[PDB]
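Structure request: porphobilinogen deaminase, Escherichia coli.
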Amino acid sequence: DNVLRIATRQSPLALWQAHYVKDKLMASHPGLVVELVPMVGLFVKELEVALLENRADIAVHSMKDVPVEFPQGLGLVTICEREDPRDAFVSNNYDSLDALPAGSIVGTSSLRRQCQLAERRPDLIIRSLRGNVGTRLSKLDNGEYDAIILAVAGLKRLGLESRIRAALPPEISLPAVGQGAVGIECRLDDSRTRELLAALNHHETALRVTAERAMNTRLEGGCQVPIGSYAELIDGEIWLRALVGAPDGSQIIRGERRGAPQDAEQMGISLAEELLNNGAREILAEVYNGDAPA
Ligand SMILES: *Cc1[nH]c(Cc2[nH]cc(CCC(=O)O)c2CC(=O)O)c(CCC(=O)O)c1CC(=O)O
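Returned structure:
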């Protein structure tokens, strides 16, 4: 059966991602008929509903938005080639974070982004910002913020690379799990769909994201959590860095692991456990408020 139906969110960025996946599919399988089923754990739930009741065959997500847990019968089966994983400084009136005067307003609702900015620059005012990329840029242009923090990859994909005033190195702002990579979820028993997706998997990115996600999973993380988790392949090994921070920047718990790619999952679990035992458990508890990772 030649049809593959893609469930996606309906934003410009989300639809760009659905086209990316559709184009890769058509390139590998010229006989396929690819259909889009746009709609809408926050966002992914409706997509997963569609998979479970056979209205869609795959759901395409940005990796960092993929939940740590899945309903019976679904899973993340493909991790596509990673784009730039970094955060970006975006500003009309200033050329860097360094240039912002005390009391400047920087927008982001990421507690991961916030704790790290606040660690280094407690004089800056960090203000919530929500919405699609286009809307967030509008609020900036409208004067609501002196600067905002967005992902490099999103801006590049939307043709808005001119908005990247500065890319932030991972040592300055450690990325969200799988930032820059697209992931695909489907029904685990659907061997036809999984065979069609095989050509889209990028093994090197999949190794990195495996480590990162194992770390986050053990911390019972999500987007609403001040967690950084970021791996690179360096001289045949996976190098995983992680952090958990108090949003006010007062305490940031950090650690690292290096090892063979086949150990990606156990490395991430081990690192998570180390952070938990060195203060992260208590920080997370004040965020989930009560609930702590066991
Ligand atoms: C988990 C989480 N989601 C978002 C919003 C979002 N999701 C995907 C992108 C594009 C980049 C990519 O594909 O990886 C974006 C927007 C963006 O980061 O530019 C966020 C950001 C929340 C915020 O800053 O308000 C987060 C949390 C987090 O990144 O730590």
